Design a protein around this nucleic acid. Structure first.
Ligand code: ZN
Lengths: 88, 49, 49, 96, 1126, 291
DNA sequence: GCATCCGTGAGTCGAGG
DNA sequence: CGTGTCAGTAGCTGTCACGGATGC
RNA sequence: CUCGA
């Protein structure tokens, strides 16, 4: 039917990263106010995407230790974000 | 050859550029504009920069 | 070349039907060639650049 | 990636250079599938050659997560990086 | 009085010349063309009294040319006859609403004639839904009114050219035989005194090769072309000789790669030029050849084909012209002059209208079906064949669809104001298929030709790249069935003007001499002067005896267009500003309330009625019931007709088309009278603007060079307020992970933004919506594997599960704001036929009330345009002696340069209309008002007057009226006999030192408003391929720092500003994000990176087998975050 | 001229064999993308058709070679493969171009670099964010170094700077909500915007940019309305009358760019014509009559 | 050795389709 | 899958100046 | 296609 070189076809566009860059800046601020243990566990579960046992194997800690650190560190970040007015 | 291929006769310049295997010293107004360097003129010369 | 018959009336007086008709010949070609003369002007300009 | 590099060299591309660039040969003439939007293998949009349509998502669907970063899938042959590689990975056609 | 025929307001004209012939139907070009195509009873009765015997419509003509269809043997035959139409499928407004096409089903009668069985089966076969033309002369394709534009094409026939050679500097000559269809044939004489012929663009064969292939002996050629030495040198320099030899020579150059048989070339050389299958000169193409060559000039036009005699007479015409001959008679033909043709002359330049352009597309669609017929005949059996089995209507309906859907002649209708639509239906476009390319149009096709007088307007034409290529039809002009443009003239018997009027074509006009319209004529008809200004062939104007005038012009405005004829005092404005004056009238915006101009021309009435945006009574009667919704008319016979008002409808260009009733309950109204008027109409006349009190003076630099100063009264009293309506649309589709649904429930949105939505997620009627507000709440399901690491962490730290959908709601664009006036919902669930993959469709109409703002573009009728630079308070305005402040201040410097004094004369007459006048009746009629009609000697305030083009008010009468202007309510005369008045500075109080010209001018609000033209962008979308910001305001794009703008930065030496523009601010993928962070952080601006567009350039040079590499200072090649494998 | 070509292959050390290809490279797919249409159908780049016809004919040649078909079929197939690669690189260069649907010549790889629409002139010599445009209106009260831009234009142009200040003065809790405030135009932004644009110069441009004074720097002044207010003395340089003209605005971000606008490009520092040395910002129309 | 013919170039920006 | 009597573009020239390789 | 400077 159509050719992109041919006129009358809309060119593809990609949105700007403003909303993503602002969230990344606020997440980076809330991350700095965390313990080296909690910060090094959320950055291995959400930034590296590893499994629960994979983080437990790397850090040399128990399985439930990674589950507990992740459980608090998420709530710790929610504390810092709600204190700065981040929308739910 | 980069300042010439963007002026006129693009294919005629790029053919002779690849046959003669010319290398372009990226030191010119038109060239720095394309690659994103500071133009070697005005506040871009090394004396003021 | 100029028409052997001039437009005797003034725009304050008001041109006749035939006077107005012969005037548009030079008026339209005056606007027409202006688009071509600006193209050759800008082309010469970018060659000089 | 600093912005100071002196020369920009141009030359004839050897047929061996074309193979040194290419991440695979485009054998079939097909493009994609018109129901699943998945590109056909060895076609002009093959994910084994050019790269994954989506980030960290392979063709056969076995590897869809970020933890398997850099794994060459054995069942479909697609690498798992971002779709940014589909703007720089070259293909080639071997002429008879 | 002016235009006392329909019952219009009494506009009094400054007319000294009577109108012998009233303006024709301004919509006839679109109407008559379509009535002939479908053979309507109106066209048939028109052709009946025209003298025609057995006339044939456009569809009947295609069926007769097509019938019959036979195979090689002749055992099978198919024929068509009797085309007829059933009622229209859906009404006009239903098609606009449901986005379908206005069409009627076309029925024909087809039958199969079998010679080998002696039996025929006849039946009715449905051909296809045939697009129908509305009463307004428009078509409706997929719910959009379109206009099929008449095309100026080169008329079929034989044409001769006198070209000058480049190298030898000798006069050459060439011939072209342009058929109405088929292959082309051009003879020429090169610079070597030899004659050749190019057959269908192919190689140029010697002219005797064609003669030998047709069966002419080498002796008879010397007998015919012996009087010239250039033909003796042609037969001598010839290569091959023989009837069966040059016939194969043509075959191998025309159809290469095939075995050349003496009868395979004998077949095509008869089919390509002499069989009606692959070649055809139309009735106009045959007649144009029979006149140019001077043969068969008395025979009835029956030959629809080229003949061998014409080819010989053409070569004879060429060879004589080359050696200076000026006269020739074909053996057995009348005498004819030997000359070259203009191809720009309107006798050789043909106009094909709506019916022909559609007919040609039907003919091509029929021929594609004919091939299907012949193929389906030889495949199926010869006894179960019916007309239904041989006919596949797919290529036919797809051929008319391809035309109306995609064609330079099928144009999106101009609908700014009624005049813009009327002008669009009367456009004459040279561009398009069969015409010419824009790159193939020199300065000669575009300029005014002397044959355009009274046919195409020399003023109304765009000033852009389409100048001269698009013209407007003259007022009284019409098109004959051949395709040329006829214009009426008054036949002068023996120096006596007669009321007998006859239409003459372009060449017919050249065979006589015509007198100018404003000739002094006796009451009996004899010219006052023996010598009168007369137009002659080749554009000659000179005096000539009264016993020589053959015809004369009907009206002074005979040469101008409808829009051009609406400029008062047009004879006082140069052609440049007159062109802009007519072009900007089509750009007027319909205001809330409309005022007819005080200074008119008389054309505004017929321009409004013939446009079709008013409501005229079909039959006389009384008004039974009148409402804002509809008007009911009780006829004399007893029947009732009810006309429905179009209220607050969106036009094609966003203007407000709103009709209002004029008549009241129980008003006797005659037939053809305006009972309700629409946009830009007042009592049935075109009201493109308002009458504003103008002062011609500089005012503190706010009106400096073409800026305009306005009184805030125009804002307070909605004088220049206009309504605009925008259409917003969104659909809910089926996606890979589910289906988009339109719901009020939108993730992470408060109940305050969703407060204006109903329970469905749609904004409610009457809500006022700013930019960014939600119009339709739509959510689309997004997969889990498509989530950012931060977005997945952000989803975990908020505990909001089951939000697998994202926001894709329809929001209000930047710069839009208004009241929601209408909602339209289309659902697949509710039987509404949506495109496959769509479940719901919503259209929201938003109306904004736009007052006049600083920067909006105003203009008059004389090409005097300008934006609004300042809107002072009503007390700051320079006010007259009695305290009334002026409405608009126009700078004086921009008046005597443009040569548009008409605005000054309009200002003077405009004031006299506002105030009124009374001529001194005692001691006789004064010497200046001797030519004025008795109806003009007295005028009440706010009187309407007419200044017809090239006629109307003279400066002597205008000067006299200023001397007897009526006083105001206090008895004081405010303006002087010079036309100037004493003004007071509203800011200081001191009166201005000198009197200033003050009066009333008609000002129009053009469709160039700052509300649309303002735009700004910090960041936004980027083009996916080049990673540069988008373009256009609608896409929220950025401005283009072009090539010339980079030269300016380099000229300044602004290296850092230039690098910043081309890197971080444009296509640096990582630099633009880190710049945005550095701003919100308060940090400094980082260092620019490498443009992504340069990365794409290298990857494209690689695809062209070019090994490009970037080397460092040492020489090692450096990669760009990528590698290479084999 | 023959030596000019031969000596190039001699000295450089690259073989002339590169002029004959055994393999053709395929450009990455994102540079020849195939987009889906709102009607359900698909629209693709012409390069995909050219690559597809090269692939179709090259695979047919492999069949003929395998089948041992007559040399007339193999040779007439090899010719078509030559014309297909010729169209992929430069369609139309030899003979008649490969037409697509509607007798439209398909674009080739070399068409991506040719002329005004090519990659060089369209996307390299000219390209920008932080910019806007509107109608121009004369402003007599303005000083020569001043210009008036609409408030709604300045808010979007200075949007990130305004967000930064909204979060500093505690009008907004975080930078995220500060963005929602500018998008919603909360009344606090108009007081904040005035502080932001203070002595921050902007660039005004009217096309065509004939000389360097076609772009000049000004001190912005927040004005109501939606039109740009231009000084009457810079009208000569811009060749800008007020009959519907539009001008573009560009906001310099870096410190160096602002300094280049403040010093090099300021309208008050450029009164004389660089071509002739005679003044341009002088009384010209109403002003000369008044004097 | 020269007339032919091929290929090159032909303002910038903006709006809506 | 097998295929088997005639079975044959649309469109179009209404650009041009200029230089130099290509060609009788 | 059409229009604005
Ligand atoms: Zn896989």
């Amino acid at each position: 039917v159509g050719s992109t070189d041919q006129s009358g076809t809309p060119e593809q566009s990609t949105p700007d990263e403003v909303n993503a860059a602002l969230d990344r800046l606020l997440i980076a601020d809330a991350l700095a106010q965390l313990s080296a243990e909690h910060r090094a566990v959320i950055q291995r579960s959400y930034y590296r995407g590893w499994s629960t046992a994979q983080i437990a194997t790397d850090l040399g800690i128990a399985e439930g230790t990674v589950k507990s650190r992740l459980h608090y560190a998420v709530r710790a970040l929610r504390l810092t974000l709600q204190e700065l007015g981040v929308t739910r | 050859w980069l300042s010439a291929a963007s002026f006129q006769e693009t294919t005629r310049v790029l053919t002779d550029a690849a046959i003669n295997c010319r290398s372009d010293k990226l030191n010119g107004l038109k060239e720095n504009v394309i690659i994103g360097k500071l133009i070697p003129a005005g506040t871009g010369i090394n004396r003021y920069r | 070349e100029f028409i052997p018959r001039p437009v005797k009336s003034s725009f304050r007086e008001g041109l006749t039907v035939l006077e107005y008709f012969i005037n548009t010949h030079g008026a339209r070609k005056g606007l027409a060639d202006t688009a071509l003369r600006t193209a050759d002007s800008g082309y010469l300009t970018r060659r000089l650049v | 990636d600093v912005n100071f590099f002196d020369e920009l060299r141009i030359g004839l591309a050897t047929a061996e250079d074309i193979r040194q660039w290419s991440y695979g040969e485009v054998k079939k003439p097909e493009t994609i599938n018109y129901r699943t939007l998945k590109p056909e293998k060895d076609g002009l949009f093959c994910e084994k050659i050019f790269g994954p349509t989506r980030d960290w998502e392979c063709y056969c669907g076995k590897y869809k997560r970020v933890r398997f970063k850099g794994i060459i899938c054995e069942r479909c042959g697609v690498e798992v990086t971002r779709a940014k590689v589909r703007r720089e990975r070259m293909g080639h056609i071997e002429l008879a | 009085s002016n235009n006392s025929v329909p019952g219009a307001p009494n506009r009094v004209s400054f007319a000294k010349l009577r109108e012998p012939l009233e303006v024709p139907g301004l919509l006839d070009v679109q109407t008559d063309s379509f009535e002939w195509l479908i053979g309507s009873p109106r066209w048939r009765e028109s052709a009946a009294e025209r003298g025609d015997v057995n006339p044939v419509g456009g569809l009947e003509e295609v069926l007769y040319e097509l019938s019959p269809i036979e195979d090689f043997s002749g055992s099978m035959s198919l024929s068509f006859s009797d085309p007829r139409f059933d009622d229209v499928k859906a009404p006009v407004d239903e098609c606009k609403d449901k986005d379908m096409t206005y069409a009627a089903p076309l029925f024909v009668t087809a039958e199969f004639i079998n010679n080998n069985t002696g039996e025929i089966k006849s039946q009715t076969v449905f051909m296809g839904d045939f697009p129908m033309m509305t009463e307004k002369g428009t078509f409706i394709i997929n719910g959009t009114e379109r206009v099929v534009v008449s095309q100026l094409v080169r008329s079929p026939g034989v044409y001769f050219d006198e070209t000058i050679d480049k190298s030898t500097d000798k006069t050459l000559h060439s011939v072209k035989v342009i058929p109405s269809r088929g292959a082309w044939l051009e003879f020429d004489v090169d610079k070597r005194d030899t004659v050749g012929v190019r057959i269908d663009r192919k190689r140029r064969q010697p002219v005797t090769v064609l003669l030998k292939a047709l069966g002419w002996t080498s002796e008879q050629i010397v007998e015919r072309f012996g009087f010239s030495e250039i033909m003796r040198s042609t037969l001598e320099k010839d290569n091959t000789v023989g009837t069966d030899e040059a016939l194969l020579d043509i075959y191998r150059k025309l159809r290469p790669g095939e075995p050349p048989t003496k009868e395979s070339a004998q077949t095509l050389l008869e089919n390509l030029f002499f069989k009606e299958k692959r070649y055809d000169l139309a009735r106009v193409g045959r007649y144009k050849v029979n006149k140019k060559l001077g043969l068969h000039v008395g025979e009835p036009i029956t030959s629809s084909t080229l003949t061998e005699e014409d080819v010989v007479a053409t070569i004879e015409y060429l060879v004589r012209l080359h050696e200076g001959q000026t006269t020739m008679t074909v053996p057995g033909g009348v005498e004819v002059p030997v000359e070259t043709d203009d191809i720009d002359h309107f006798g050789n330049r043909r106009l094909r209208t709506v019916g022909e352009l559609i007919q040609n597309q039907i003919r091509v669609g029929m021929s594609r079906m004919e091939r299907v017929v012949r193929e389906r005949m030889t495949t199926q059996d010869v006894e179960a064949i019916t007309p239904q089995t041989l006919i596949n209507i797919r290529p036919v309906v797809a051929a008319i669809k391809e035309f109306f859907g995609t064609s330079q002649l099928s144009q999106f209708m101009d609908q700014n104001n009624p005049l813009s639509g009327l002008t669009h239906k009367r456009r004459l476009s040279a561009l398009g298929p069969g015409g010419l390319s824009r790159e193939r149009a020199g300065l000669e096709v575009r300029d005014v030709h002397p044959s355009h007088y009274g046919r195409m307007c020399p003023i109304e034409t765009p000033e852009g790249p389409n100048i001269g290529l698009i013209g407007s039809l003259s007022v009284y002009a019409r098109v004959n069935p051949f395709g040329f443009i006829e214009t009426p003239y008054r036949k002068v018997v023996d120096g006596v003007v007669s009321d007998e009027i006859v239409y003459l074509t372009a060449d017919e006009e050249d065979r006589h001499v015509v007198a100018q319209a404003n000739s002094p004529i006796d009451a009996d008809g004899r010219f006052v002067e023996p010598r009168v200004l007369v137009r002659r062939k080749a554009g000659e104007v000179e005096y000539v005896p009264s016993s020589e005038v053959d015809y004369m012009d009907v009206s002074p405005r005979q040469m101008v267009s409808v829009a051009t004829a609406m400029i008062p005092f047009l004879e006082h404005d140069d052609a440049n500003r007159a062109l802009m004056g007519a072009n900007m009238q089509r750009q007027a915006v319909p205001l809330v309330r409309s005022e007819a101009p005080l200074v008119g021309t008389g054309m505004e009435l017929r321009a409004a009625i013939d446009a079709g945006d008013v409501v005229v009574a079909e039959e006389s009667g009384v008004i039974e019931e009148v409402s804002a919704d509809y008007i009911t008319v009780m006829h004399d016979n007893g029947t009732r007709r009810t006309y429905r008002m179009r209220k607050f409808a969106r036009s094609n260009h966003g203007t407000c088309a709103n009709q209002c009733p004029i008549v009241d309950a129980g008003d006797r109204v005659e037939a053809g009278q305006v009972i309700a008027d629409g946009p830009c109409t007042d009592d049935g006349e075109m009201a493109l603007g308002k009458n504003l009190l103008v002062a011609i003076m500089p005012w503190e630099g706010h009106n400096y060079e073409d800026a305009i100063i306005l009184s805030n009264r125009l804002v307070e009293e909605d004088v220049l307020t206009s309504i605009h309506i925008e259409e917003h649309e969104i659909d809910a589709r089926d996606t890979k992970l589910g289906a988009e649904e339109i719901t009020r429930d939108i993730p992470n949105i408060s109940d305050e933004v969703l407060a204006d939505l109903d329970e469905r997620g749609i904004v409610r009627i009457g809500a006022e919506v700013r930019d960014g507000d939600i119009l339709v709440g739509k959510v689309t399901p997004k997969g889990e594997t498509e989530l950012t690491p931060e977005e997945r962490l952000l989803r975990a730290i908020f505990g909001e599960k089951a939000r697998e959908v994202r926001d894709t709601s329809l929001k209000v664009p930047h710069g839009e704001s208004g009241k929601v006036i209408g909602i339209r919902v289309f659902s697949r669930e509710d039987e509404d036929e949506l495109p496959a993959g769509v479940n719901e469709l919503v259209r929201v109409y938003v109306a904004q009330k736009r007052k006049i703002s600083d920067g909006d573009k105003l203009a008059g009728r004389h090409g005097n345009k300008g934006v609004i630079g300042k809107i002072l308070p009503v007390e700051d305005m320079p006010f007259l002696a009695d305290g009334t402040p002026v409405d608009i201040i126009l700078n004086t410097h921009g008046v005597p340069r443009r040569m548009n004094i008409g605005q000054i004369l309009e200002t003077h007459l405009g004031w006299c209309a506002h105030s009124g006048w009374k001529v001194d009746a005692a001691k006789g009629v004064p010497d200046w008002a001797a030519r004025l009609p008795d109806e003009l000697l007295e005028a009440q305030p706010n009187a309407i007057v007419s200044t017809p083009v090239f006629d109307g008010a003279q400066e002597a009468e205008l000067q006299g009226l200023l001397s007897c202007t009526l006083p105001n309510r206090d008895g004081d005369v405010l303006v002087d006999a010079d036309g100037k008045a004493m003004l007071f500075d509203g800011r200081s109080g001191e009166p201005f030192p000198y009197p200033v010209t003050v009066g009333y001018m008609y000002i129009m609000k053009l469709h160039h408003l700052v509300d649309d033209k303002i735009h700004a962008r910090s960041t936004g979308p980027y083009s996916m391929i080049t990673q540069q910001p988008l373009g256009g305001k609608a896409q929220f794009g950025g401005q283009r720092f072009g090539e010339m703008e980079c030269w300016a930065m380099q000229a300044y030496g602004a290296a850092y500003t230039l690098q910043e523009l081309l890197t971080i601010k444009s296509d640096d993928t990582v630099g633009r994000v880190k710049v945005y962070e550095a701003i919100v952080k308060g940090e400094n601006i980082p260092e620019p990176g490498i443009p992504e567009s340069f990365k794409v350039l290298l990857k494209e040079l690689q695809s062209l087998c070019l090994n490009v590499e970037v080397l460092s200072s040492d020489g090692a090649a450096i990669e760009l975050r990528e590698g290479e494998d084999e | 001229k023959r030596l000019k070509v031969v000596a190039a292959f001699q000295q450089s050390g690259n073989s002339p064999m590169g002029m004959v290809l055994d393999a053709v490279p395929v450009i990455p797919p994102e540079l020849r993308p195939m987009v889906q249409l709102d009607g359900g159908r698909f629209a693709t780049s012409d390069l995909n058709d050219l690559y597809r016809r090269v692939i179709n004919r090259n695979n047919r040649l492999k069949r003929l070679i395998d089948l041992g078909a007559p040399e007339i079929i193999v040779n007439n197939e090899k010719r078509m493969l030559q014309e297909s690669v010729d169209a992929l690189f430069d369609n139309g260069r030899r003979g008649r171009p490969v037409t697509g649907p509607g007798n439209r010549p398909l674009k080739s790889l070399s068409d991506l670099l040719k002329g005004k629409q090519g990659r060089f002139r369209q996307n390299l010599l000219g390209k920008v964010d932080y910019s806007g445009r509107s109608v121009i209106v004369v402003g007599p009260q303005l000083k020569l170094h001043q210009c008036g831009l609409p408030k709604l234009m300045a808010l979007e142009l200075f949007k990130p700077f305004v967000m930064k200040r909204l979060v500093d003065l505690n009008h907004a809790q975080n930078i995220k909500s500060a963005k929602r405030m500018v998008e919603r135009q909360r009344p606090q932004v108009w007081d904040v915007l005035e502080e932001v644009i203070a002595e921050h110069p902007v660039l005004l441009n009217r096309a065509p940019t004939l000389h360097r004074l076609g772009i000049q720097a000004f001190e912005p002044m927040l004005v109501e309305g939606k039109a740009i207010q231009l000084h009457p003395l810079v009208c000569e340089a811009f060749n800008a009358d007020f009959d519907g003209d539009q001008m573009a605005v560009h906001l310099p971000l870096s410190a160096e760019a602002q300094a280049e606008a403040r010093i090099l490009m300021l309208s008050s520092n450029n009164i004389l014509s660089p071509a002739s040395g005679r003044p341009l910002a002088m009384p010209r129309l109403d002003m000369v009559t008044g004097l």
